[model samples]
Target: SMNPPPPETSNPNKPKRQTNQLQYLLRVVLKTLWKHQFAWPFQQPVDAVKLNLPDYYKIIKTPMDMGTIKKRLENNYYWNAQECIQDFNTMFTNCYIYNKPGDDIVLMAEALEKLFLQKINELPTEE
Candidate 1:
């Protein structure tokens, strides 16, 4: 008798799974910018300032300080956009368990990609 096939790696029922249409596109954009050493544009202005406060950093103490956060994004050390988005979602979800606002669950993956790409394009190319 034939044996049953192995379980599928792509599960649609998983809450962490990206079922959105733009998910893959955003991943591609993130991967491209990351490959070019472009930052994710998360924080700025002061030591603990939240310049471009996205869902990820708004609720979590990731990277601990501005210096590390800056280095993480600036150095393109993130594995992928999905990881970033999931982290943000996790933080947002946890925060929501407390006294968080409804708008705190926003995701900035796409916006960050656009901004990074724009910044990259505005910069002069080197030989």
Candidate 2:
């Protein structure tokens, strides 16, 4: 018998499940960072051609973004906030890896990253 658990991600329109305290808070926290003034570069992938950064792709392999994370959140791709946090974590880590400290982009990412973790830390610890 192949009785198994239901598909979590493939059934978006099926019905709205009970979002836990953490899940609800995660989206709120993520939304805040997504709309942060310095979030433009993190909103989408680095345009290798338009930005004239030919070495972009070769440098940051796991190019993550807020848009992609939004889609993933809506699709229920993350098991929990920690998983989603890791994605945001990568978003900032990738920036530090690709750019040097004191650079504008690096400093911007530092601010965003700080607020991100700061907000996340403010969430309910029991959740």
Candidate 3:
């Protein structure tokens, strides 16, 4: 007698299903960062006009923000944890390049960055 098709548990989509651990950890870290007050300014993309940083677009060629990364993370836009971390670093670097060193935004950038890396370090590693 011929055997019927196996259960969905054995489906080739296991990769997507199993990727939850890393993805879930990322979301948790991001949510924690979002709750921090310093994360306010980084929640969204830079508002050049409203922020009065007219040359913002000139200085930051590759703009990134927490909200944008959040969206991408939700959609599984990142193939690995490194990608997410890279974007965060990019966002911070942009702020460093555009904002004054001793100003509030810069301070916020440093604060959030430290918290972010600290949280990320606590995550479980497959390696």
Candidate 4:
């Protein structure tokens, strides 16, 4: 009787085994894109998206759906998928304009504030 393998997504604290994690993940994504080579709407201005909020959200939230992303990763090939996930984690958890605690995240904060404030001001206020 043989034991079955563990789930693809296991506990985070179990210690990542990959040494070149980030590079692996990026390569996976690049490979998938190269293999498919589909055209997406990247050239359009932000204002065009504003007219269709739902579509805009869908476009932004799209993830790597390629079969290769799931296939080789499930096999634990010690390859790109491992690196791709590692890079994704580093981007969201590590990259920040401010380093010190209590410091404002000025880069993104200021940009959002300006865009939001401008948009809100354009809306009609109650008389």
Candidate 5:
């Protein structure tokens, strides 16, 4: 026998879920960099449009590609990804100068670093 379920009413006040956590996190980090005048690790100096506009008003507040974060973290002097995270923590100890992010957000950044290093380690070397 087929069973039928009763219909449920929808509530108007339920909170909506935001679906882009990774992208949102990336934007937060980039906005912090732009706010503190941190140079892009692999980017050229700001062009005329970006130079003339404030960080808040820029068309692209964050880097379009998240790979920029990975590249910067890997290019640092640390021999390992964990070491890079430690160094990053040390460098940003002063919240005012470096702009403190939430613990979870920092952890997310660390994950990006570890992933980058893992991929780099997997590359085949030429003889």
Candidate 6:
């Protein structure tokens, strides 16, 4: 008798099942940074008054906010670089959806790994 295996999950160019590579890139770069400790991601300085622009703010209001990203990163909290990289690899590798066929999508995985690692590295450290 023949048996079917479970479905695989991984996406190099997409985060969700529907979004494209460009969408994912845009979402990651702009939306992710906006909601972090930066408070307002976009602003205009005028005569000693800092005004947050509505248009720019409106651009990044996705279902997943910076808080959500922070939580996800926190899920992989580690002390050293190696530990963090390892944790990041494990967490992200299994989390996303991959359209490509194969057991090891190494290049795409590494690309995403770098992106995830870069973002995590930008944050403040804990003691």
Candidate closest to the true structure, highest TM-score: 3
Stretches off by above 4 angstroms in model 1 are 1-71, 100-127
- Cα lDDT of candidate 2 equals 0.70
The digit string of per-residue lDDT tens for model 6 on 1-127 reads: 1212211223244333222322332345334544444323211111111333334223322222223333323332222344323433443343233213443434444445565557655544432
Which RMSD values do the candidates have, in order?
15.3, 8.5, 12.7, 20.5, 20.0, 18.7
* Candidate 4 lDDT tens digits, 30-75: 3433333231211112222344434433333222222333343444
lDDT of 2 by residue, 14-114 (tens): 53332463465446777888788898888776666777777877777677777667766776666566666777888899889988889999988998988
Task: Give candidate 4's whole-model lDDT.
Answer: 0.33
CA lDDT, every prediction?
A: 0.36, 0.70, 0.72, 0.33, 0.33, 0.35
Worst 10 residues of 1 by lDDT: 1-10
How does each model score on TM-score? 0.26, 0.76, 0.79, 0.21, 0.25, 0.25
Report how far residue 83 has shifted in candidate 4, in Å: 9.3
**Per-residue lDDT tens digits of candidate 5, residues 1-127?**
2112211122235432322322322244433443332334213222325444344113332222223333433233223334333433333332122224655434444544444344434433322
lDDT of 3 by residue, 7-121 (tens): 1222234333225545754567788888898888988777777777677777777888888777766656655677677888898898898878899889988988888888877
User: For model 6, where is the 10-residue window of minimal lDDT?
Assistant: 40-49
Candidate 3, residue 1: the lDDT equals: 23
Report the C-alpha displacement of residue 127, candidate 2, in angstroms: 6.1
What lDDT is reached at residue 26 by model 1? 40
Q: List the residue pairs that clash in candidate 3.
A: none
In candidate 5, the residue pairs with backbone N, CA or C atoms under 3 Å apart (3 or more residues apart, or in different chains) clash, namely: none
Q: What does candidate 3 score on TM?
A: 0.79
Candidate 3 wrongly placed segments (more than 4 Å): 1-21
User: Which scores better on TM-score, 1 or 4?
Assistant: 1
- In Å, residue 60's CA in model 3 sits off its true spot by 0.5
